[PDB]
């Protein structure tokens, strides 16, 4: 309590054609042809879109507890990072609007906005915003993990504590999930879910009398 969390912009969301690859392995789509060719295949009154550090003020200064993304006026991060705490941005209180403890996700100022859906076999990029480091794109080939309610992509990459909430993007620069909700395998490997919810939409119209 005590509006102890604040936000600070760090980067914009995009795919980087050349970013470092990391992982024990690579998934590469090859196209083979008959001909014998083989080929490798206005200022808006809204928070600036992008990636932000989430910062908790104590005695040592501001420590980064996680990362989130503004997209269409809505701030998206992980449930475990904020547990619904108000977030200060430009002296304004941001209140939580929607949360999924199961998927480990939370949005502030509206419903989930991300539309990306990861396609098995494709490589993705995590835009890792580690405490005290410049943003960095990391290309990786996710596996899948088998859950109730469907199958989920799963990334085997280790980042510093505080990196949870960094977005995962596909080749069009669309966000397919957030990184940082994971488990550790018996062989000692950390794997993060590609955490993603359906984009929200308008319900039926209400009315009222409270002026």
Give the interface with a second copy as residue ranges (CB under 8 A): 1-2, 4, 56-65, 79-80, 82-85, 101-104, 130-133, 145, 147-149, 152, 154, 158-164, 180-186, 188, 190, 193
Token pair for residue 6? 């604040």
The b/e string for 92-114 (b: 16+ C-beta within 10 A; e otherwise) is eebebbbbeeebbbbbbbebbbb
Shortest reach from residue 86's CB to a second copy, in Å: 11
- If the CB atoms of residues 34 and 202 are measured against Cl ion, the closer one turns out to be 202
Token pair for residue 183? 């488990």
Shortest reach from residue 113's CB to a second copy, in Å: 21
- If the CB atoms of residues 23 and 204 are measured against a second copy, the closer one turns out to be 23
Shortest reach from residue 144's CB to a second copy, in Å: 12
β-strand pairing of 5-11 with 50-58 = antiparallel
- If the CB atoms of residues 118 and 210 are measured against a second copy, the closer one turns out to be 118
Judge contact between 53 and 91, C-beta under 8 A: no
DSSP letter assigned to residue 172: T
Contact of residue 83 among a second copy, Cl ion, none (CB under 5-8 Å per partner type) = a second copy
Contact of residue 132 among Cl ion, a second copy, none (CB under 5-8 Å per partner type) = a second copy
Contact of residue 34 among a second copy, Cl ion, none (CB under 5-8 Å per partner type) = none
- Helix (H) and strand (E) counts in the chain: 1, 19
CA 153 to chain CA mean position, Å: 13
Dihedral sign of CA atoms 13, 16, 19, 24 in order:
positive
Shortest reach from residue 16's CB to a second copy, in Å: 21
- If the CB atoms of residues 58 and 206 are measured against a second copy, the closer one turns out to be 58
């Amino acid at each position: 309590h005590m509006a102890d969390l604040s936000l600070e912009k760090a980067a914009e969301v995009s795919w980087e054609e050349e970013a470092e690859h990391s992982g024990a392995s690579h998934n590469i789509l090859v196209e083979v042809q008959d001909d014998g060719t083989m080929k490798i295949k206005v200022l808006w009154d809204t928070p600036s879109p992008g990636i932000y550090r989430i910062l908790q003020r104590g005695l040592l200064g501001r420590s980064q507890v996680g990362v989130g993304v503004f997209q269409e006026g809505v701030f998206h991060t992980m449930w475990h990072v904020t547990r619904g705490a108000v977030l200060m941005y430009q002296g304004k209180r941001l209140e939580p609007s929607w949360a999924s403890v199961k998927k480990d996700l939370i949005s502030y100022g509206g419903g989930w906005r991300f539309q990306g859906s990861w396609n098995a076999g494709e490589e993705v990029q995590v835009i890792a915003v580690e405490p005290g480091k410049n943003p960095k794109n990391v290309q990786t080939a996710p596996g899948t993990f088998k859950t109730p309610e469907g199958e989920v992509g799963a990334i085997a990459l280790d980042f510093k504590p505080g990196t949870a909430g960094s977005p995962i993007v596909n080749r069009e620069g669309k966000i397919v999930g957030l990184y940082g909700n994971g488990v550790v395998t018996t062989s000692g490997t950390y794997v993060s879910a590609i955490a993603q919810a359906k984009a929200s939409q308008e319900g039926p119209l209400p009315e009222i009398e409270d002026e």
